[PDB]
Ligand binder design. Structure first.
Ligand SMILES: *CCC1=C(C)C(=O)N[C@H]1Cc1[nH]c(/C=C2\N=C(C[C@H]3NC(=O)C(CC)=C3C)C(C)=C2CCC(=O)O)c(CCC(=O)O)c1C
Ligand SMILES: *[C@@H](C)C1=C(C)C(=O)N[C@H]1Cc1[nH]c(/C=C2\N=C(C[C@H]3NC(=O)C(CC)=C3C)C(C)=C2CCC(=O)O)c(CCC(=O)O)c1C
Ligand SMILES: *[C@@H](C)C1=C(C)C(=O)N[C@H]1Cc1[nH]c(/C=C2\N=C(C[C@H]3NC(=O)C(CC)=C3C)C(C)=C2CCC(=O)O)c(CCC(=O)O)c1C
Ligand SMILES: *[C@@H](C)[C@H]1/C(=C/C2=NC(=C\c3[nH]c(C[C@H]4NC(=O)C(C=C)=C4C)c(C)c3CCC(=O)O)/C(CCC(=O)O)=C2C)NC(=O)[C@@H]1C
Ligand SMILES: *[C@@H](C)[C@H]1/C(=C/C2=NC(=C\c3[nH]c(C[C@H]4NC(=O)C(C=C)=C4C)c(C)c3CCC(=O)O)/C(CCC(=O)O)=C2C)NC(=O)[C@@H]1C
Ligand SMILES: C=CC1=C(C)[C@@H](Cc2[nH]c(/C=C3N=C(/C=C4\NC(=O)[C@H](C)[C@H]4CC)C(C)=C\3CCC(=O)O)c(CCC(=O)O)c2C)NC1=O
Ligand SMILES: C=CC1=C(C)[C@@H](Cc2[nH]c(/C=C3N=C(/C=C4\NC(=O)[C@H](C)[C@H]4CC)C(C)=C\3CCC(=O)O)c(CCC(=O)O)c2C)NC1=O
Ligand SMILES: C=CC1=C(C)[C@@H](Cc2[nH]c(/C=C3N=C(/C=C4\NC(=O)[C@H](C)[C@H]4CC)C(C)=C\3CCC(=O)O)c(CCC(=O)O)c2C)NC1=O
Ligand SMILES: C=CC1=C(C)[C@@H](Cc2[nH]c(/C=C3N=C(/C=C4\NC(=O)[C@H](C)[C@H]4CC)C(C)=C\3CCC(=O)O)c(CCC(=O)O)c2C)NC1=O
Ligand SMILES: C=CC1=C(C)[C@@H](Cc2[nH]c(/C=C3N=C(/C=C4\NC(=O)[C@H](C)[C@H]4CC)C(C)=C\3CCC(=O)O)c(CCC(=O)O)c2C)NC1=O
Ligand SMILES: C=CC1=C(C)[C@@H](Cc2[nH]c(/C=C3N=C(/C=C4\NC(=O)[C@H](C)[C@H]4CC)C(C)=C\3CCC(=O)O)c(CCC(=O)O)c2C)NC1=O
Ligand SMILES: C=CC1=C(C)[C@@H](Cc2[nH]c(/C=C3N=C(/C=C4\NC(=O)[C@H](C)[C@H]4CC)C(C)=C\3CCC(=O)O)c(CCC(=O)O)c2C)NC1=O
Ligand SMILES: CCC1=C(C)/C(=C\C2=NC(=C\c3[nH]c(CC4NC(=O)C(C)=C4CC)c(C)c3CCC(=O)O)/C(CCC(=O)O)=C2C)NC1=O
Ligand SMILES: CCC1=C(C)[C@@H](CC2=N/C(=C\c3[nH]c(C[C@@H]4NC(=O)C(C)=C4CC)c(C)c3CCC(=O)O)C(CCC(=O)O)=C2C)NC1=O
Lengths: 177, 164, 245, 164, 164, 164, 177, 99
């Protein structure tokens, strides 16, 4: 479990030397960024419930074979396990946003999931679809271009951070497949 | 590693919650103390060699019996080794100083050091003479900023109070 | 008609089963000490599970956004089921907890005196030792087909060792009210997957450690210890009898 | 209560360590974000009456069928209960807002509210209509400071996202 | 599934006994209740369509606000979803009615239903209006046999008392 | 004691549920098989004395060496003991017969009987000779009703199959 | 576990009303104090090893009956336990310094300590003596008037905070007796 | 080890077929080194970089895919073998690799 700081430190430890000026400069870009990340995580974690609902509901909307008998969303049991899985994923993604590195996401959530879904017969394409919808809806909230809820924030640019969050969701969606 | 954001993410993971405003204020304090702390990391990466040199030179200036022929450090290779060990210590102070907290410094340097140092007949009082030499040679305004210097003091004191 | 009018003394069965009651009114003092003492042991071993300061994978305690509170409700009910026992179950637990605490003490005279001395510490010592060492049943992970199979068989033979009667005991207690079962199922699955996400270094010492519990609780026998050398999850499957289950 | 200093303290106490500089930066962020949300706390204790009144009035303005004689809120005492319930909620937003984190609000109001509300046939959508009404009737410059207002938004959203 | 013979064989299996006369008396109770209950399963497979149609129609007869454009059921596809969902409920009442006990109806319908229905803004009071409508439209001698009918009542009530 | 009611109650208590229809059918089977079992219990309370007398007399008719002066039953007082042991057993057959199931017969007579009998040099084959003598001297229509007789058979066989 | 904040909130909850400007004014005195408490905790937590060692060694110095046979300090085992007890006491005192309220100290350490020492035969007067020596040593470090180590800090007024810490040590020493 | 919920007392235990488990690592290694050896001798069949005559693998407009279907089925037939044929194959393949 390693943030941006610990990632710089670990890389300098494999390099076996002091962090130096250059690594601290990239770290000053992180620290100097700061409250954009803070407000970004506030945006995703604010509307998190709604994201999860919409994404899984949308996933069922594109192919109704999930709710068809023999689909993995056919029962209350399996649907509720589906909803908690989407929720946990978004949880660790928010952790990955405050961290700045995907270490917590790789170690605590990604590590051992693929084997498990394969053993349980969860359709992986549908999961990557769920992750993709949570990605798009999360980037739309994080850019404040959501058409339903649009809150006041002092303006600027937060696009690179959006690219970071899209990278985390692409890591999850690439991992489940 | 033990740090601010890993303590808060670790606590939210252990709790099973979304990261609320408490973790946000914690990382707020991280991003505010960071400017002061990093500067000390820059200057440590500046003159670590003279830090290690004065540290070890004063360490054997206090304890001469180590270069006598009982006690361990009585050969040129082991005085080299002792100097390198102090260089590892200052590098861990640089690492934990960059991270924020004591995590790099605890898990690499402190954890399990008692067995090694007790095994290999290594006295802690020599190390503490070195670190307290550096802490007394620190000064106030001339090299560093005072505030960041306090951070440095803290880390060095932590090492002493994790050693004996 | 009872002599007492106010705070008429009502020692608990555990207090009476134990030697705490006495002349000096110690029963307040000794019972209070056991409570304080028990938490000290637990906090020590919880200090051993997280040296570095951040909570491990063992302590996540819930994935769903209200499942933590569910674990709090479940923990207190389980203590309440521990309090509803009969006489013989209590004396059986105090003696077996006593002997297992002594066998885990590894011959330290001082500790043995303090396990006979206080009933409460010994039992939380057993449980907390077996949780900190990662050696008991929850932390078993099969690694062949034959480990998984023999944990099924071994497990079944243990449950037949615990309830020879058809009547379900208080210990199984999966649910208290409606909807408890599904939530306990959820958290129970999250525990096993959570164990899947342990660090590599820990799992190796957990294996060795479960073997060490296997050699202890099995006995000095070539057969059983041969099997534990073949498969180490069986040593985790040796529960104590002071559990029911 | 879940808060900054209680999370750091719990982390240190669970580990069995002295509080190092990491907890110090966490509480630094507590003491720096404090002024804003305490201002918001002052204003909420200013006009809570009108907050509860507009909240419940817009809540039954959306859902009229509650005062019909099936559904629960169809008597004068239970409309008094509805207003009273919303008063609890705003006071918990004030408490959590003063504390910092979601602690007063979680452990008094949220924890085990699912059993209560689902047992007593209490629909969450009415509460969410109330809170979203208040959060949309909020304001940028006129009543509050913007920054503090964000803190208010957070706490209110948390209630919504702990309801449904 | 939770049932007579599964409870008893499960108990005997956990215990590690032969099935004695106690389990034989349990399956005696199964073979004695069976025909009356099955008959009710035959009639439910007879007229489930009209059951679902009157159930949903009376369900929106009570709750009109659902087809208003806030609340969820305000589109033709979701009223279809509402109708089909009830159809699943009657099919589960048929299954648990055939089995004996609440096994399939608990593990397929009731297990984890709280999360789903609470998540997707689904009111339980609409379901309960539907089932209590069917339970009040039940009659006595005219369609069914009285004794079997009681079994039907039980199953349906179980669903109600597992909802709120 | 293991009984139909206890089995169902234990299952519901261990599960944490209200008693559903499954337990109701189990106790339905109890209340239906009851008369056959009770009748057999009435007749066993009728003629237990002559049952014990024929049992033990045929037991020593098979095994004569017991009244030899090694083996246990070699004095008139210990033959009184042998008779008493058989009388306990018939009375436990009566108890379990009235209860329904093998609960009192198991927990009073069988549980830990192996250590007692093997400790006090008691052969089980003498008991088995006694019980199988009673079971072969039993009857179909002349003393009892046939169906209830089957109940009797079961319980006596249980004793035998719990002995060796 | 209740800090200053949660103490204000609990008092307002027993009063059953909102927070209000008076309690918020006292809270502004706390937050406005701030880095005095930060630097104070840094001072005591820095020299923690020295205080525990010196205080317990002084406690053995006033009455050598502890190290005498039959005394509770007569062995390495019992001495080790005492050293860890003094350390844990100072640890919870420092927790009560960051908290601003003694709730963590009352719940996590104080609740049943006298009964425990009475059950184990620990001499309570000796413990109160050790808590007293740690009191004086800790106030001397917290005022930076320690005769061995004097580090540079920007000056100000720290007496009230010293009174707070002395109140916590008097709470512990009053509790152990 | 199939990752299937096995019960031990109080909580189900999941079987580890990933990461630290040694059999899994060994199985992965064999597949990886097997493909390595194949790609080395395929590097020896085409040194120049043009694909040889042997690698045509067809002529008809859909025959390639037919060969791909045949190869997977042949691996499946390799997997449907009895005990003794598998041990016989491992030992004879071993001594021929030695020779
Ligand atoms: C209540 C949750 C919520 C709030 C609040 C909000 O502003 N919007 C949603 C989350 C949200 N959803 C999307 C993206 C898509 N959502 C859907 C699902 C709907 N589309 C349909 O046709 C149907 C059935 C009729 C449903 C339920 C889809 C398909 C998308 C687009 C998928 C894609 O590939 O891009 C977004 C992002 C868009 C935006 O609003 O900015 C958000 C925030
Ligand atoms: C405690 C060790 C127990 C003993 C002894 C025993 O014989 N069985 C235990 C108690 C017990 N549990 C149930 C009922 C259920 N238990 C469930 C939990 C498991 N199901 C799962 O899928 C998982 C995760 C893989 C777990 C942990 C569930 C669910 C049920 C059924 C719930 C329901 O709605 O009926 C019972 C009753 C069933 C029986 O064994 O007769 C008992 C006694
Ligand atoms: C730890 C190594 C210490 C450093 C560094 C330092 O500057 N002084 C140490 C800590 C310290 N100790 C006190 C207070 C007292 N210490 C006492 C113990 C000694 N007094 C004795 O007579 C003996 C035996 C010969 C010992 C071991 C006593 C007593 C006190 C005073 C107690 C009281 O009631 O006030 C202090 C505070 C005083 C100061 O130095 O400013 C400190 C910092
Ligand atoms: C001022 C309050 C002191 C004073 C300070 C002096 N330090 C001198 C030299 C020197 N100091 C250090 C240690 C320092 N340099 C660092 O970069 C760091 C940490 C990152 C530390 C702790 C070194 C390595 C050196 C040698 C290189 C240099 O000259 O800068 C110094 C020069 C002469 C001397 O050795 O004393 C002074 C004056 N000395 C004083 O007497 C007052 C009290
Ligand atoms: C008798 C005590 C009642 C009475 C009963 C009536 N029900 C009528 C119609 C009807 N009832 C149902 C529900 C019923 N049919 C089933 O198959 C099942 C369960 C398997 C149930 C619960 C349906 C679906 C229908 C419509 C089809 C039909 O006509 O049979 C009914 C006819 C007129 C009416 O709607 O009332 C009667 C009379 N009604 C009474 O007033 C007494 C009290
Ligand atoms: C403790 C909680 C906590 C937060 C929630 C944040 C809130 C926060 N955001 C900014 C400040 C800002 N926040 C954003 C964010 C964005 N602007 C856009 O137009 C996008 C919609 C959005 C992408 C995330 C921007 C662009 C700024 C100003 C630029 C900057 O300060 O870097 C500031 C600077 C001070 C001020 O503006 O008054 C603060 C405190 N910080 C915190 O401490
Ligand atoms: C990451 C941090 C880190 C450290 C801090 C060091 C600490 C350390 N030092 C030694 C080992 C050693 N360290 C010293 C040093 C000493 N010589 C003396 O005269 C003095 C007492 C002292 C210097 C002040 C010596 C001499 C050895 C070799 C000891 C021996 O082999 O006898 C070893 C054992 C392995 C080895 O031989 O190198 C380790 C782990 N290593 C690490 O990885
Ligand atoms: C309330 C009563 C009470 C007790 C009686 C103790 C019992 C106890 N001892 C240890 C723990 C320990 N106890 C000993 C003691 C021993 N060293 C040896 O050489 C001897 C065999 C033995 C002394 C006779 C050691 C060495 C440890 C640490 C073991 C280790 O970490 O390897 C632990 C685990 C927590 C810890 O590390 O401290 C516990 C609960 N604790 C309590 O709370
Ligand atoms: C799947 C794996 C698996 C095992 C490894 C065993 C383990 C095991 N052994 C026993 C039970 C037993 N095991 C032994 C064995 C011992 N006799 C001694 O003198 C030695 C100490 C030791 C052999 C080295 C004995 C004697 C019993 C009976 C104990 C008793 O009833 O007193 C029981 C209780 C059930 C029973 O009575 O059989 C179980 C579960 N069973 C399993 O299902
Ligand atoms: C095996 C049993 C079984 C059930 C009982 C259902 C229960 C159920 N319904 C829905 C889902 C749904 N159910 C309804 C139904 C409703 N429309 C309303 O106006 C009424 C309140 C209500 C009918 C009375 C609607 C509208 C949805 C879609 C909700 C949405 O997407 O907003 C879902 C989520 C998956 C999906 O979208 O289909 C599930 C699990 N599914 C099952 O597998
Ligand atoms: C509740 C049920 C119940 C029983 C079934 C008996 C079973 C039983 N029998 C004996 C004990 C005995 N039982 C017998 C009986 C025998 N004499 C023989 O020649 C025959 C082999 C056999 C009769 C068929 C004898 C002789 C003893 C005394 C044995 C001895 O002391 O040597 C004892 C030991 C205590 C005692 O001495 O009485 C017990 C528990 N007791 C019970 O409480
Ligand atoms: C993250 C870590 C962290 C710390 C460790 C503190 C460090 C700190 N202390 C002060 C500032 C101060 N610190 C002290 C403290 C005291 N002075 C005395 O003479 C006593 C010996 C001692 C009692 C505790 C005083 C008196 C001030 C100045 C007054 C004040 O700012 O309130 C300041 C103000 C800025 C400056 O002075 O440059 C800071 C940042 N704050 C932090 O954020
Ligand atoms: C494998 C060791 C073991 C354990 C863990 C055990 C009992 C046991 N502890 C359990 C739970 C349990 N025990 C703990 C304590 C604990 N976990 C740790 O990692 C450490 C170091 C702990 C303290 C010693 C936690 C966090 C939990 C999960 C939260 C909770 O459920 O309350 C359970 C599950 C159900 C229940 O609460 O009873 C069980 C069945 N019996 C054992 O032999
Ligand atoms: C009486 C029955 C009972 C229990 C058992 C506990 C269980 C429990 N732990 C919690 C939560 C919880 N638990 C821990 C882990 C734990 N704390 C540590 O500091 C260390 C070292 C730990 C392992 C030894 C942490 C870190 C938290 C988060 C709260 C905190 O900051 O301490 C929560 C809060 C859940 C939530 O937020 O929804 C509960 C209910 N509660 C009860 O009522």
């Amino acid at each position: 479990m390693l943030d941006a700081f610990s990632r710089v430190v670990v890389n300098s430890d494999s390099k076996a030397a002091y962090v130096g000026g250059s690594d601290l400069q990239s770290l000053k870009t992180f620290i100097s960024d700061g409250n954009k990340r803070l407000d970004a995580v506030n945006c995703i974690v604010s509307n998190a419930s709604c994201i999860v609902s919409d994404a899984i509901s949308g996933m069922i909307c594109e192919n109704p074979g999930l709710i068809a008998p023999g689909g993995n969303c056919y029962t209350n049991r399996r649907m509720a396990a589906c909803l908690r899985d989407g929720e946990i994923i978004l949880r660790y993604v928010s952790y990955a946003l405050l961290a700045g590195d995907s270490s917590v996401l790789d170690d605590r959530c990604l590590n051992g999931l693929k084997e498990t879904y394969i053993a349980l017969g969860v359709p992986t394409a549908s999961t990557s679809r769920a992750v993709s919808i949570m990605k798009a809806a999360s980037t739309a909230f994080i850019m404040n271009t959501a058409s339903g809820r649009k809150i006041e924030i002092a303006a600027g640019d937060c696009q690179a951070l959006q690219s970071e969050a899209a990278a985390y969701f692409d890591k999850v969606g690439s991992a489940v497949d | 590693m033990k740090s601010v954001i890993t303590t808060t993410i670790s606590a939210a993971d252990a709790a099973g919650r979304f990261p609320s405003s408490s973790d946000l204020e914690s990382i707020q304090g991280n991003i505010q103390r960071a400017s002061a702390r990093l500067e000390a990391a820059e200057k440590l990466s500046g003159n670590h060699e003279a830090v290690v040199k004065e540290a070890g030179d004063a360490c054997f200036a206090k304890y001469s019996y180590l270069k006598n022929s009982g006690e361990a450090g009585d050969s040129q290779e082991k005085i080299n080794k002792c100097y390198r060990d102090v260089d590892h210590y200052m590098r861990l102070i640089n690492y934990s100083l960059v991270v924020g907290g004591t995590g790099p410094l605890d898990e690499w340097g402190i954890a399990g050091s008692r067995e090694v140092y007790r095994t290999l007949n290594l006295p802690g009082s020599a190390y503490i003479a070195s670190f307290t030499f550096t802490r007394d040679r620190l000064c106030v305004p001339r090299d560093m900023s005072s505030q960041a210097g306090v951070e440095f003091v803290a880390a060095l004191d932590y090492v002493i109070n994790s050693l004996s | 008609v009872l002599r007492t009018v106010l705070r008429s003394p009502v020692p608990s069965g555990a207090a009476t089963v134990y030697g705490y009651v006495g002349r000096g009114n110690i029963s307040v003092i000794l019972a209070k000490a056991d409570e304080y003492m028990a938490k000290s042991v637990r906090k020590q071993y919880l200090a051993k599970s997280n040296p570095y300061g951040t909570f491990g994978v063992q302590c996540t305690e819930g994935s769903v956004k209200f499942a933590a509170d569910f674990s709090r409700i479940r923990a207190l009910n389980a203590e309440f089921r521990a309090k509803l026992g009969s006489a013989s179950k209590k004396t059986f637990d105090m003696y077996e907890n006593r002997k297992n605490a002594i066998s885990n003490s590894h011959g330290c005279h001082h500790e043995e005196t303090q396990f006979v001395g206080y009933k409460g510490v010994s039992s939380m010592y057993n449980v907390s030792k077996s949780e900190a060492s990662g050696s008991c049943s929850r932390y078993a992970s099969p690694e062949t087909v034959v480990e998984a199979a023999m944990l099924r068989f071994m497990d079944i033979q243990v449950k037949m060792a615990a309830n020879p009667t058809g009547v379900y005991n208080i210990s199984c207690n999966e649910g208290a009210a409606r909807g408890q079962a599904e939530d306990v199922r959820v958290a129970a699955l999250n525990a096993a997957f959570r164990q899947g996400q342990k660090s590599l270094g820990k799992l190796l010492d957990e294996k060795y450690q479960q073997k060490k519990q296997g050699y202890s609780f099995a006995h000095g026998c070539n057969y059983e210890e041969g099997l534990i050398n073949k498969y180490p999850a069986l040593g985790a499957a040796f529960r104590s009898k002071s559990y029911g289950y």
